[PDB]
Amino acid sequence: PAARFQVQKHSWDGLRSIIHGSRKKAPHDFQFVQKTDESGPHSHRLYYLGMPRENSLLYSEIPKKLLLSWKQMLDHFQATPHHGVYSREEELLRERKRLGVFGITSYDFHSESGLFLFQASNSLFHCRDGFMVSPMKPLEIKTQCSGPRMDPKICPADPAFFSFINNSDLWVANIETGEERRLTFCHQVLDDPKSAGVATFVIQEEFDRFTGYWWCPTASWLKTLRILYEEVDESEVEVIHVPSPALEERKTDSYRYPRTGSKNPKIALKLAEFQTDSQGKIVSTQEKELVQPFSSLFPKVEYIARAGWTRDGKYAWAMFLDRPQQWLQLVLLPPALFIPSTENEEQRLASARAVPRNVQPYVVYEEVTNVWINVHDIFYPFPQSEDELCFLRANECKTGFCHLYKVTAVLKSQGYDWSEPFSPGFKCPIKEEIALTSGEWEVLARHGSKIWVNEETKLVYFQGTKDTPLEHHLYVVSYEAAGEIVRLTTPGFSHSCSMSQNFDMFVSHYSSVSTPPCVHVYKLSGPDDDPLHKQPRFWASMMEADYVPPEIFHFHTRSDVRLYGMIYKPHALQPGKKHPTVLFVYGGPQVQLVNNSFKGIKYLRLNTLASLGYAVVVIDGRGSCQRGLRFEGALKNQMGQVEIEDQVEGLQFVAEKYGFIDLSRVAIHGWSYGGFLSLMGLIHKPQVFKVAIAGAPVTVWMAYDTGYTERYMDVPENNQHGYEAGSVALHVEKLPNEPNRLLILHGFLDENVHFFHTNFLVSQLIRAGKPYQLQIYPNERHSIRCPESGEHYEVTLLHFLQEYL
Amino acid sequence: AARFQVQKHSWDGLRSIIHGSRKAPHDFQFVQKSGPHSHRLYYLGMPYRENSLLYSEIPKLLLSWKQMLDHFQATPHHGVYSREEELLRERKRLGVFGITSYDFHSESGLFLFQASNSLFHCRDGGKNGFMVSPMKPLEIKTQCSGPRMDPKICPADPAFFSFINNSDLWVANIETGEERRLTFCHQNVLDDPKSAGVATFVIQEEFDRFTGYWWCPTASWEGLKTLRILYEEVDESEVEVIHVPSPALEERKTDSYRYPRTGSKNPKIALKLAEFQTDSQGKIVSTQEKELVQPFSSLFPKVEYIARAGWTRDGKYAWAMFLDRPQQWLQLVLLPPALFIPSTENEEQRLASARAVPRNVQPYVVYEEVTNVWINVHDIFYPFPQLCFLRANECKTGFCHLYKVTAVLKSQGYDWSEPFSPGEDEFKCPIKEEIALTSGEWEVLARHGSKIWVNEETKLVYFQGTKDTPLEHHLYVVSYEAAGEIVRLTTPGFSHSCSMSQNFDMFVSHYSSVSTPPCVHVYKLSGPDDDPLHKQPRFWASMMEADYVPPEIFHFHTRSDVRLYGMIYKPHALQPGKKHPTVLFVYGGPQVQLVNNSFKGIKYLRLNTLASLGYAVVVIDGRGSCQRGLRFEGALKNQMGQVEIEDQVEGLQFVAEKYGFIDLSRVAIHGWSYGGFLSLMGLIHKPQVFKVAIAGAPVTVWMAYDTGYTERYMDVPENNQHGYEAGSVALHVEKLPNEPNRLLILHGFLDENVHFFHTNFLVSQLIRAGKPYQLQIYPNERHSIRCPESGEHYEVTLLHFLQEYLHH
């Protein structure tokens, strides 16, 4: 009647000016340094990256006795290459981190020497920090190598040295003496498949590891410095072509992209040793391989998740995952199990006979599961004191929730003749395994989340949902006594925190649905006899700050499982009117759109929708993150099948509690996984969703990579019913016959979800005589960087809804 | 309101309409014989399945199409061709599964053709005897690995034949099974840029040549029977490389392509000679690479492309058509076989057999066509025995006409050992005479498979032309001996494609009109032999005879006093006084005429479907059009997209004044290929005129198009800044509508002619200009739609875009 609300129909010029009105990084990567000056006014110096232009190295002065200043470290200077055009290698590392920020995106620091190393321009730069006041020129490190120098790290044992990858080989260089040295020789495209120190595509894109080498923290005495590093051969991995950004050139780029049920790269851990004298020259280098082949020592291993060393460098270590990603073990690798590699079988067996029968790999932990093994970063080894090994470890697999565990595993040597080859199938006795935190909440140990362990006071600081899944909070618990867990961060808000290495101060970037992010400096003051109950006291603020925030709801299901949601309400609502509804979707795992943190930056378009009078509903459904393994396990082997049920469940719930929703004019829209679910919604529930606008969708699972699909959908061989059911390209017969009910968006340069996905869906749509609309983003990969396209993307989104909803 | 309104159909509705609406012998060979049948016409045809080798029996009435091959499938699994052949099939614009091109040797009666994977053959006629039941084709085995492109029988000896395999020339023997390789230019991708016998992408797409070798018609004997082949050696190393998607979509890989974009380096070219000797038993004995005594690029500087090549009928010379980069200077040159020396490793061995070459021997520049517009390449070049020869020459008058030329061959004598730079006309023969056999404001057909047939016994030259009217191809006869009376041999009112017997007694004519479907009538030429010019064409037998309202041809004069022709698809059941919406259908590129007197129903069925729903459809051959001579084609020179939209408006306002059922407030410009390019110019230059544009496979950037097409019309980018920057629709996106639903873009994702980049780059610039757009991909389609399932969709989207949007 007069009840149905009608969005003001605008001209396309009209929508451009509305959207142009819509748009009219905070401190991160923190290094705390104490001033070592009892009489001066500053107790600390915070180092970080931040903006006003580009990201850059900045510092604040923490006083002894309130906004801080952002003092610039670099004497003006530019870390962005002309026109923001990165190298091929650089731009492809910024997609795998979803990095969209120009300038210094990361750095390496050495508190002992004040050495700042960092990739900038198209080379490396460095600076030193007594304590300066005004900025300084960062000295460019001169090379004689050809291409870009990737993944720079300072040698912890000696800051005179540093490392980098160049043409997928490990190099080492001295910043003082400019001397550079290649340590590995795996390269000389497609013709060259071996690489060394490089984290391959699927390792970065789906296992969150980007470096493929690891400094030895200690030198052994000439001194000698080692580096652990993953040797890799992509010879058997399928090869695909994606269009270069240089469209004028009309050329592609080759990738090693292993589709599900395809060979992954052959992998191995190895050592690169080199010696140095008093004056500093690199006197010699040595390639070192495992005394037994990696593939036979650690069989069943498919991806190397993580690796590192003890703090003493006694042993190296590695997190190893099997193909079905249902099995995970941490292995102690002593530096002596590695020999000098050679072609002389005689020379090699004299090194193999010399490796003592006592030295051996110690499998120190193992995680089994019937769902899948999320890779958590957290594995902290305590220096061996009083034959054994004590360590903390975050274990979602034990109880189905990520929690911390202090573990001791016995290191009793079986003994082996390393000259003769053998085939096992090293599991240590666990001496004990104490639960430090438990419960139906969880510990944050993924996507850069970390702990900080003060051994002086015997406390583990961490980050968890203990209070609520809508808010990340900082927690301290003892690792001697598994007793009281003290929360230091204050409710209402979600926090991303950074602890000093002296555990005397923290920073907390925090925000809420209703208020923009702050970045506050809290000191930890109180009795030193009672450190578990240090009170956080606000010391200083580094950052304060048409938008109507949404509000979080919760509701249960016909399974009684609780789900949370957000609603943007139609701005200036007249209770009684029913409004057209846009259902904003993600629905994949490893994401949670619904949490108590300010949404206005990233989801500014959802408020713009609300400002035209659209109901924007957003619902974390079963499969979404932060809620533990059983809640995420809902997707496994049936992707696309469970997620829409909940989205319709939360949609109908929203219509009872809010009653401004017109169930007749609902629309589904998402990118990435969300696009994939926008198209499952229009197949299985077209009586519910009038239109679907699906962006960057996965239309064929068999064309997606192994590391993501197998973990959730298994191997095609074993789960065809699921691959076929969750492949929206095969169910195109069930997509609408009425035109204007489906808009397709895809970034033509997408090397993550390949434009082949839209391409093959349009092919199936044409065969089945289904209409469709299509937008291409010819200068865009999986996400849309360029502001120009963004406006266009949104102007199209508003016009498409206006005319056809 | 008296504004007609098209019925608004649901999407299923339009699918059922298009699906409703969609519910000729060629390559003829005449052979003589004795009982009831005089001849046997061999031909390719697709009897109501796939194109196949057929024969009719010309007796002393409708001819039966007899099967020559027994239960034989000539097309591979479904339509899954090799990559090399299916591009050969796109470059010839070939859309029929089965046998498409075949070779025939009348004396021995040898038929030879590409089929399925390999080569096949079957003898018939001559010394073997005539078949009455379909024959089984014999397989010619191969020790070669890849496909064998471009088979040809050796004219001088039918025991042998040639083929390209892996970018190299091979010769084999059908009898012995003996293969042998003659050219070693191929050893990989960019690391293997050399090739011999192959005609490079552009040659195929722009100069209409799909073979880079040519058999000698004769054999010589030195001191064993020696057979020669002229061939083009190719070096694509310095030619840009581009990646177009495979049709293996699930594979997610591309194919590389040596695509010379305009103002870019072209394949380094050269003519080499390949000799080989056979004995009594036909065993291949020696084989000889040979090459021009002096490099090709110093004997003939300024030559960018080998348009054409071949031999004289006695083999005394090999000839070639040479063309410059601008394409405004063409040459015909004889290359005496004695001008070729065996290629050798040694400086010292190369100067020995150079000293050895007689000074009397040399290349002779026979003919030299200059022009201020551009040289179209014309197939016709008939040398007589002995040098006298017939040639087609557009440049001379501005219309393509036959000329009889005598060239004087006088040697200047050259020291072939010493290195030699020629002067500006170092080899040009004195022309003794040059008589025009044909003249007038009408052209002889000499491109796209048009050919003359010359009867040396009677001194008559048989040709097809536009003499009567540009709307109709006709068969004419004239005498090269006496340039006098031109007798026409084909009925007027129809347009004829025609093929002449080598005995000049019967001819075929496949012909049609706007109003009548195609026929293939066989005609005998009778009349006393006293007078051969005036032999009446006597209808002998038919091979083919015989919803759709055919369109109406008209003509109008421009305000520049130029006569343009158009066509009108009348709105079915037209109520005079109603004003209907108008789909202006466009091409407008050169080398194309759409308005002629021939059946349009098969190719442009959508243009009658459009009419059935009640759209007016208007087709106009603006300037730049073909079949109207060089000054008419020349109108586009360095102005592509500047002259013809005016003509499309001019011919559209006209149709409005004449017929008076057109509604100029609802007109829609729509075309594919160059037509798409005009659609987008039409929406930039005349948005008051055209309310929606649907552009298919459009060229948006000329700087990303090939050299042979673009440089012949638009020059180098460094010599036509304005022209490239005016005729590039991607550079003028600011001038596209701020209003949405006024522009639909279409592009197949495997287009290797116009690269999908062109659209991709327009979409980049649309977005940068903040402009709406619609877009449809064709993921299994290059520069055209072969898969029907796509075609119907395309059509169903054309009706749906027009109905919802082309309004008020």
Numbering used by the authors:
A (entry chain B): 20 to 43, 51 to 78, 82 to 94, 101 to 164, 169 to 227, 232 to 264, 270 to 434, 437 to 475, ...
B (entry chain A): 21 to 43, 52 to 61, 65 to 79, 82 to 93, 101 to 227, 231 to 266, 270 to 432, 439 to 598, ...
How do the authors describe this structure?
DPP8 and DPP9 are the only known intracellular members of this family, both localize to the cytosol, the nucleus and associate with the plasma membrane. Here we identify an association of human DPP9 with the tumour suppressor BRCA2, a key player in repair of DNA double-strand breaks that promotes the formation of RAD51 filaments.
We present crystallographic structures documenting the N-terminal Met_1_-Pro_2_ of a BRCA2_1-40_ peptide captured in the DPP9 active-site. A truncated form of the synthetic BRCA2 fragment, lacking the N-terminal residues Met_1_-Pro_2_ (BRCA2_3-40_), bound to DPP9 with lower affinity (KD) of 75.3± 4.8 µM, highlighting the importance of the N-terminal dipeptide Met_1_-Pro_2_ for binding to DPP9 ([Fig fig1]). Previously, we had shown that binding of 1G244 or SLRFLYEG, initiates a rearrangement and a closed conformation of the DPP9 active site. Importantly, the binding of DPP9 to BRCA2_1-40_HA was clearly blocked by SLRFLYEG and 1G244, demonstrating the importance of the open DPP9 active site confirmation for binding to the BRCA2 N-terminus ([Fig fig1]). Control reactions contained no DPP9, or included the DPP9 inhibitor SLRFLYEG. To further understand the cleavage event, DPP9 crystals were soaked with the BRCA2_1-40_ peptide. Strikingly, DPP9 crystals exhibited positive electron density at the active site corresponding to the N-terminal Met_1_Pro_2_ di-peptide with the proline residue occupying the S1 subsite. There was no trace of electron density for the rest of the peptide ([Fig fig2] and [Table tbl1]). These structures with the di-peptide captured in the active site clearly document intra-crystalline enzymatic activity of DPP8 and DPP9 resulting in the hydrolysis of the BRCA2_1-40_ N-terminal peptide, and release of the BRCA2_3-40_ peptide.
